Structure formats: structure tokens, C-alpha cells
Paper text:
Here, we present the use of the [name] (GD) HEK cell line for protein crystallization, which produces homogeneous mature-like trisaccharide glycan stubs. The GD cell line is derived from the HEK293S MGAT1−/− cell line and has been transformed with Golgi-resident EndoT (an endo-β-N-acetyl­glucosaminidase similar to EndoH). This enzyme processes the Man5GlcNAc2 glycans, allowing the NG to be further processed by native Golgi-resident enzymes to generate mature-like glycans consisting of one GlcNac (which can be fucosylated), one galactose (Gal) and one sialic acid (Neu5Ac). The glycan stubs do not need further enzymatic processing, and we show that for heavily glycosylated fragments of human colony-stimulating factor 1 receptor (CSF-1R), murine [name] and human Down syndrome cell-adhesion molecule (DSCAM) the NG modifications facilitate the production of diffraction-quality crystals.
[name] is a soluble cytokine receptor-like protein associated with the heterodimeric pro-inflammatory cytokines interleukin-12 (IL-12) and interleukin-23 (IL-23). [name] is secreted as a monomer (denoted IL-12p40) and as a homodimer (denoted IL-12p80). [name] can also form a disulfide-linked interaction mediated by Cys197 on murine IL-12p40 to form heterodimeric cytokines with the IL-12p35 subunit, resulting in IL-12, or the IL-23p19 subunit, resulting in IL-23. The crystallographic twofold axis present in the [name] lattice is located at Cys197, thereby forming a crystallographic homodimer. Aside from the homotypical disulfide, the interface area is very limited in size (287 Å2) and lacks specific interactions (13 interface residues per protomer and no hydrogen bonds or salt bridges). The electron density allows the modeling of a Man4GlcNAc2 glycan. The immature glycan was clearly present in the crystal structure of [name] based on recombinant protein produced by GD cells, illustrating the general versatility of this cell line for structural biology applications.
Author numbering:
A (entry chain A), B (entry chain A): 23 to 158, 161 to 245, 247 to 275, 287 to 288, 292 to 334
The structure:
Amino acid sequence: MWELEKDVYVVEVDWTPDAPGETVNLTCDTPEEDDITWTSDQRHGVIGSGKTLTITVKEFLDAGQYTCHKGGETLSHSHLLLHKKENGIWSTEILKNFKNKTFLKCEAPNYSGRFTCSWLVQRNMDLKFNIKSSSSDSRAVTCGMASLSAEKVTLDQRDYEKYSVSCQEDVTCPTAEETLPIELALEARQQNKYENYSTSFFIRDIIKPDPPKNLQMKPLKSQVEVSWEYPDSWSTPHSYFSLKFFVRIQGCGAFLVEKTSTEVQCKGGNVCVQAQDRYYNSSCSKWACVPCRVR
Amino acid sequence: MWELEKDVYVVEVDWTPDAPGETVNLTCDTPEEDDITWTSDQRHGVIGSGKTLTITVKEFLDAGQYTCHKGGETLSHSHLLLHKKENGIWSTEILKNFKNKTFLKCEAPNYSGRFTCSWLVQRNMDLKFNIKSSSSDSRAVTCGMASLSAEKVTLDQRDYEKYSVSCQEDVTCPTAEETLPIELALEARQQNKYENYSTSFFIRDIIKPDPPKNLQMKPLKSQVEVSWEYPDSWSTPHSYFSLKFFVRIQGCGAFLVEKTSTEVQCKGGNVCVQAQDRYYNSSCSKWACVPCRVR
Ligand SMILES: *[C@@H]1O[C@H](CO)[C@@H](O[C@@H]2O[C@H](CO)[C@@H](O[C@@H]3O[C@H](CO[C@H]4O[C@H](CO)[C@@H](O)[C@H](O[C@H]5O[C@H](CO)[C@@H](O)[C@H](O)[C@@H]5O)[C@@H]4O)[C@@H](O)[C@H](O[C@H]4O[C@H](CO)[C@@H](O)[C@H](O)[C@@H]4O)[C@@H]3O)[C@H](O)[C@H]2NC(C)=O)[C@H](O)[C@H]1NC(C)=O
Ligand SMILES: *[C@@H]1O[C@H](CO)[C@@H](O[C@@H]2O[C@H](CO)[C@@H](O[C@@H]3O[C@H](CO[C@H]4O[C@H](CO)[C@@H](O)[C@H](O[C@H]5O[C@H](CO)[C@@H](O)[C@H](O)[C@@H]5O)[C@@H]4O)[C@@H](O)[C@H](O[C@H]4O[C@H](CO)[C@@H](O)[C@H](O)[C@@H]4O)[C@@H]3O)[C@H](O)[C@H]2NC(C)=O)[C@H](O)[C@H]1NC(C)=O
Ligand SMILES: [Cl-]
Ligand SMILES: [Cl-]
């Protein structure tokens, strides 16, 4: 057993059918040594005595908050969390991996050093999350607090609630090549179940620019000119942070164009265009569409 | 002759004792072709006629503003500047080089990409300055407007007025090694004299941190502890952007200490400390001093 925060301990337990639980000792933060009794918020009545309580922890009813008591007064408390281990493998039950069997998916709309990471939960109940830089050589990152998103991700015939966190690399270098990845670790808590997850990535690999903006269209000799602009969130200056665009007619039959304008032949329909980093093949934006109509 | 801005041209002239001036043609921005006369703000009365004025420019009285005139109305103007060339060498007369025979000295208190460049003038009269990135591969820089500083630099038995400009690298990388220098060009104008100057530097080489702050002192078994803190302007985090300090008793007999505190034996006097980048030998701060007295 090890301490996670003050008066909160993680007990690693093996859930193979009949495996012996862990014997843990809880000592009461008190000077007294006589008439000390213990209680648990998972059980009813005195379940132990003495200043040091020894118990066998194997199932979740053994976890929770253990409280001290002497002469009718409560003296101290301690909280136990279980980190499950089955078939020799840490449990991955709080989060549901994405389609590619990964648990944390992160995204950046530019090279600012800002990015958002997301994960899916199997049950949105009594959750506590904490994400931070795994190592601090390392690219230090500052992360906000996780938030529940209105967007439910559908997998199988599943609708999962999604949590996302936005972070910022403390000191950034948008231009130079990244030679060390950003390393993060997520701690997940559900009631008294403890899990943790990790990921490592380069910003250049998780790039996903916003869609082109102000997609206008003008008529010419039919032939039609479609033009757009770089999204406002994209890194500046555009001369260095240059993008490419795919234009089609209705990760990432649409043809490539490098300028912010291109000729085409629509005459009735919606014309859509996406963007991508010009010199690196990261992810492409969502489609920006506008009706194809002129006078 | 070449155009600097609209209706302002630079004429390169040789000032070797008796060298032939340059023949320049000034054409009047008018449809008319008859009864066109010319005047100069350096001379009195009509000094030319015709829609195209041909003149020999060798001295500064030949420069200035030439004005068109027809039937009593002024039609157009053109302004001439001279870029002096003597003994086969461009003139360096508006600015006075620093002690090391350079003209532009720049300084940065951190790796933010912000820095200030300064130069000295021989005569603070009718001056116009403009500084910009020489090439725009290149580290683009945005510069404010030059300003006269109260600090007069004394050289020889000289007291020179100093001009300084503050600029910012548009996109910075404080951590990675600089492999290309920042290249700037200063244009200097004094009345109708034109000159320009250039410099190239790495930020790491022009680093000059601010002095240590809150230099406190406490007594111990005599022996005295002096402690300080990193300046607020220094790059963060200090764990990466680490400094060293020299401590002495009263570019950069004072001994080195790496922590922000050190023991010493003063008992009466001022104790001074300076700072320097820990892993690179740039310039050292100005001394931060405080009286050495305790109770
Ligand atoms: C993701 O999840 C994994 C799995 O849960 C995490 O791995 C665990 O991390 C913790 C914290 O880093 C590790 O804890 C440490 O364990 C060492 C070694 O302990 C041993 O030797 C001691 C010798 O005296 C002995 O007393 C210890 O006994 C206790 O534990 C055993 C079971 O391990 C139990 O049977 C006994 O009854 C005791 O209860 C033990 O045998 C320990 O030395 C560490 O503690 C010192 O240092 C820390 C940090 O300075 C300090 O806080 C302590 O107070 C103490 O001073 C610490 O407890 C644990 O071993 C990891 N588990 C595994 C399997 O490796 C992982 O960290 C998570 N990652 C992220 C990013 O969240
Ligand atoms: C620092 O200071 C130095 C010295 O002053 C600067 O160097 C000068 O920079 C300017 C601007 O870049 C240079 O000007 C250019 O000159 C070329 C070549 O001109 C020649 O060939 C022409 C062929 O038709 C000919 O007509 C020209 O004739 C004129 O000039 C000669 C004297 O040179 C004169 O005798 C004639 O009577 C004419 O008046 C000339 O022989 C020219 O082609 C350039 O112009 C075109 O392109 C520019 C930019 O697109 C455009 O603005 C023009 O309208 C034109 O379309 C331009 O005029 C000059 O040559 C440099 N001097 C030297 C010695 O190299 C330097 O730039 C400064 N640096 C900084 C950072 O400030
Ligand atoms: Cl990822
Ligand atoms: Cl310099």
C-alpha cells in the first residue's frame, strides 16, 4: 500500500478468482492507546479495535473510509482505494478505449503549445480525474480541470460520455523540430476504484487545424471561383505555417490546391473544402461548406 | 539614383576632392509640357525649366526638395537625399561607433525574443531613423519607434546622445539552440544626408540579465548569510533557465556561488552580487548592492 494524498492510500489487489488479499495496517493518529475502536463506511458496527488495525483487503467492501473512535469521540480517519489487477494485468474499466484501442486522444489546432486531451467513461458516476506531465529534460505542461462534453461518442451501439482537458506547454518552440514527446499521465478514480493511464505524443502528430473561413464564391466565364482564408486559430505567420487544402463537391475524390482560391464547375450544390499542414501530413480539418450559387 | 519612398530619392555621390557629380533627371508629375519651371528649397529663384529637369548633383546644396511650377501653380515635388562615398567607402557620420568600433549595440534581459538596440548620434538634430529585419529562412522581428534616452554615453571627452529601439522576435524558441542570427538594418537620415547600418547577432550572445532582487542579510555564528532571488524579468522556469552569481565586497576579486544564498564575512560595508547565465557566458548584470548591517 502507498499514499496518494494525505489519509488516502492505494491498495493493489489481485482479482484472480481465489487469490489471497493484502494485509494492511491502519494506525490511528492519536496519542491514546486504550479503548480504540474502528468503523467503516462500507459496514455496520465496530469492525476492529486497537490503535493499529490489521485487516485483509480483497474486495471493494473492504475499502472506503476507516474511522477511529475512543470513548465516543472520532479521533482520525483513513481512506483506502483499490487498484485492481487481474490475470497479471492492471484493470482498465473506468475508461473505454477509442476505436484504435487507445484511451487518451489529444488534439491541437496550431503549434501554440496548447492542446486538448479527451477520454471516454463507461459510467459517468462519482468520478475524479487528474492529468499532469508524467516527468518533470521534460516538456512541462500545465493542465486545466477536466470537463464533461456535450458530445457523446458512439462506439459499437454505445453512446459514451466524453471528458476533455485543455493544457499548455509552459515554454514552447513552434518552429524547431520536436525531438522529445510530451508525456502525460491520467489518474482516474471511481468511488473507491483507482486506475491510471498514460500517453506520449508529438504536437506535430496531433495537429488538426480549424476549417477554412469565409468561403466565398464568385462567377466567371460555367466556371466558378471558390476562395477562403486561413482559420484565425492557425499559427502565424502563414508564410511559414503554410497549409494545403482539398476541395470536393457534394484522420482526414477531392483534389489538392495550395492557394486560398481555386476554379471549379459546380452550378448547383454545396462546395466543401478542408485544410491540412502543407509540409507535414497531420490530420485534416472538418469540412467548411457553403452553397454554390451565384447571380 | 533609386527611390526610397514616393517622391524621395537617394543619390549616391562621390566626395573625393574633385570627382564628377551624378547627372539626375527629375520629371514633373503633370500632363502639361509648356512653361514649366523648377525651384529648390536650397536656392533662390527659377533654377530650371522643362517638364524634365536635368542637373548635376555633387554637394548638399544640390539636394533637398525640387518643386514644379507652371503659370504660378505648383504641380509636383521631388526630394533628393545624398548617400556620401569618400575614398571608396560609404560615410559613417550620423552615428558614432561604440568603444569597439561597432555602431549598433543590442541587449536582451531574457530569452523572450524581446531585445533593445541602441546607437549614438554625433548631432541630435533633424534625425529620422528606421530599423527592421534585413531579410524576410529569416527570423522576422517587429520593432517599435526609436526614442531618445536620458543616458548620455561618454567617450573620449565626449557626451553622446543615445537612441534606442525595442523589438520582439515574432515567433520565438527560447529553449532550442539558435542556428541563424537575427539580422537588422538601420536607415539613418540627417536633413538630406542618407546612411544605413547593419548588425547580426544571436540572442544568447547579447543576454544581460537584470540584477538579483531583494538582497536580504541575516546574522549567524562573525558570519553573515546573504540571500537574493532571480530577477522577475528573467526567463522561466528557473530550473531550466538557471543563473550563476558573483559575490564581492566593497561585459561583466569576487567568488562564484550557484545558489541564491551564500555565507560571507563583512561586518561593516556594502555587499554586492551580480548574475549571469549559468551554462553560457553572456554578459553579467549590474551589481545589486545593500548595506551589510545586522542586529
Ligand atoms: C500507476 O499505478 C501504479 C500501480 O498502482 C503505480 O505504481 C505504484 O506507485 C507507488 C508510488 O510511486 C509505488 O509505491 C512505493 O513503493 C516503494 C516500495 O515499497 C516497498 O519496500 C518497503 C521497504 O521498507 C516496504 O515497507 C513497502 O511495503 C508496503 O507496500 C507493500 C506492497 O508494495 C505492502 O505489502 C506492505 O505492507 C507495505 O504497505 C514496499 O514493500 C516505497 O518505498 C515507496 O515509498 C517511499 O517513498 C514514497 C515517495 O517518496 C513516499 O511517499 C513513501 O512515504 C515512502 O517514503 C512507495 O510507497 C508502488 O510500488 C507502485 N506500484 C508498483 C506495482 O510498482 C504508479 O505509480 C502509477 N503511476 C502514476 C503516474 O500515477
Ligand atoms: C544601404 O545603402 C546602399 C547604398 O546606398 C543601398 O544600395 C542601394 O540600394 C538600391 C535599392 O535596392 C539599389 O537600387 C537599384 O538599382 C538597380 C540597378 O540600377 C541600374 O540599372 C538600370 C537599368 O535600366 C538603370 O536604369 C539604373 O540607372 C539609375 O541608377 C544609376 C546609378 O545606379 C543612375 O546613374 C541612372 O541615371 C539611373 O538613375 C541603374 O544603373 C535598379 O534596377 C533597381 O530598381 C528597380 O527595382 C526596384 C526594386 O524593385 C524598384 O523600386 C525600381 O523602381 C526599379 O524597378 C534599384 O533602383 C542601389 O543600386 C544600391 N546601391 C548599390 C551601390 O548597390 C542599400 O540598398 C542600402 N541597404 C539598406 C538595407 O537600406
Ligand atoms: Cl495521443
Ligand atoms: Cl550587437
